[PDB]
Each structure stands twice: as C-alpha cells, then as structure tokens.
Design a protein around this nucleic acid. Structure first.
Length: 91
DNA sequence: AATAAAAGGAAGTGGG
DNA sequence: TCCCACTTCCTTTTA
C-alpha cells in the first residue's frame, strides 16, 4: 500500500484537495494543512488505506511524527506546517 | 472555560 | 519470529 508521505506528495502534485493542503515553499518542500479542512484529507487517507476506523487528522499527524527520526517528513515551527526531505522530493 | 495544535508512550494490525 | 508502517488509544502541555 501507498505510504503516508507519498499520499501527501501525490495530493500536492495533483492539486485535488487544494483547500486542505498546499505548498508553502515547494522548492524547500514545506507544506501546510488547512485548519478548517484538514479533516476531509485525513478521512481520505483512512479510506485509501481501508482502515477499520475513521481516520482523523490527529491520528494522521501521529503517524507523521514518526517520520521525524528517519527524515522523510519533519515538523516545521509554523502552524500546521511540515517539510519533505530532499530524497522524498527527488524520488 | 472552549478550542486547538502538538506531543509521545504503549499496545494493536498488516503484510511481509 | 519479528520487523514494517502505520493505527488506535490515552494522556499531557501550551497557547
């Protein structure tokens, strides 16, 4: 199955949920979720995965934080903002 | 208080 | 066996 970081990168490239997520600085790989519309994006992630429970933004961000150690996605010190690694952006 | 973002330990689930 | 890549649950902290 698709990995969470790839699902988010794919959405940013397609623009299909432009009111839920957007690039802040695409050259740096920084992106930001919508305060009011992030839950719809989280719901889509859970459905794509076929998870038993409804996915929430809180649970999706819990998964996002696990990428901090390996580097694929890191939290930025700005509201609802994260950053992909150069490796993820290049791949 | 009400609301929200951010955090992570711990245990459960999937598919190797 | 036992790690993958999350998911689920619960609690805490800060603004």
């Amino acid at each position: 199955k698709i990995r969470l970081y790839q699902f988010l990168l794919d959405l940013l490239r397609s623009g299909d949920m432009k009111d839920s997520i957007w690039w802040v600085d695409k050259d740096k790989g920084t992106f930001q979720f919508s305060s009011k519309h992030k839950e719809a994006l989280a719901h889509r992630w859970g459905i794509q995965k076929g998870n038993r429970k409804k996915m929430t933004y809180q649970k999706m961000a819990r998964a996002l934080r696990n990428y901090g150690k390996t580097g694929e996605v890191k939290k930025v010190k700005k509201k609802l903002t994260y950053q992909f690694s150069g490796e993820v952006l290049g791949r």
